[PDB]
Amino acid sequence: HAVVIKKLNEILQARGKKGTDRAAQIELLQLLVQIAAENNLGEGVIVKIKFNIIASLYDYNPNLATYMKPEMWGKCLDCINELMDILFANPNIFVGENILEESENLHNADQPLRVRGCILTLVERMDEEFTKIMQNTDPHSQEYVEHLKDEAQVCAIIERVQRYLEEKGTTEEVCRIYLLRIL
């Protein structure tokens, strides 16, 4: 428990500091993420780990001069799909239903879009960066064709994410992934 929380929080705080090695920050999250240790084990730990893991990857690329790598795009997709699989295996039971999501706290405020809306944005990044590759590659090279092979895999996540939102779905979820789906 407290080991996990303190680790994760120390990491998040350290991330908000200018000089950071992003490679090591990612690798640490991953080593941290598995939680082989019994205290580490648990679904909230997994979800709250991934939630800060995905943008942790996306952010590192932005700081560095722009480049397109097939491998880099691929593994983050794996991350998002794993979070989605965990949430799917959850069956909308992580919130302790509806009447009480969790034991009440006066300080705490909970919004479904607020915590669970962020998910969509992740997907969107996957798409946007992906587009940035198709622009930056050579039009007639085979690499372009391979990237266009990745397009389908993005569409997959759009639909899947849409469906999870419908099962636990909240209003205005449809408007953006419907748009991407159209595009």
Resolution reading in Å: 11.6
**C-alpha distances in angstroms, 84 versus 67, 73, 106, 157, 178?**
27, 17, 30, 9, 18
Smallest Cα–Cα separation from 20: which of 12, 30, 8? 12
Q: How buried is residue 38: exposed, middle or buried, by Cβ count under 10 Å (0-12/13-18/19+)?
A: exposed
**Tokens 């490679």 found at:** 23
The vertex-76 CA angle with 158 and 125, nearest 5°, equals 50
Separation CA 8–CA 21 (nearest Å): 16
Asked if residue 8 lies in contact with residue 48, where contact means CB atoms within 8 angstroms, the answer is yes
- Find how far residue 100's CA is from the centre of its chain: 26
Give pairs for 140-145: CB < 8 Å, separation 24+.
143/70
What technique solved it? Answer: cryo-EM
Helix (H) or strand (E) holding 63: helix 43-63
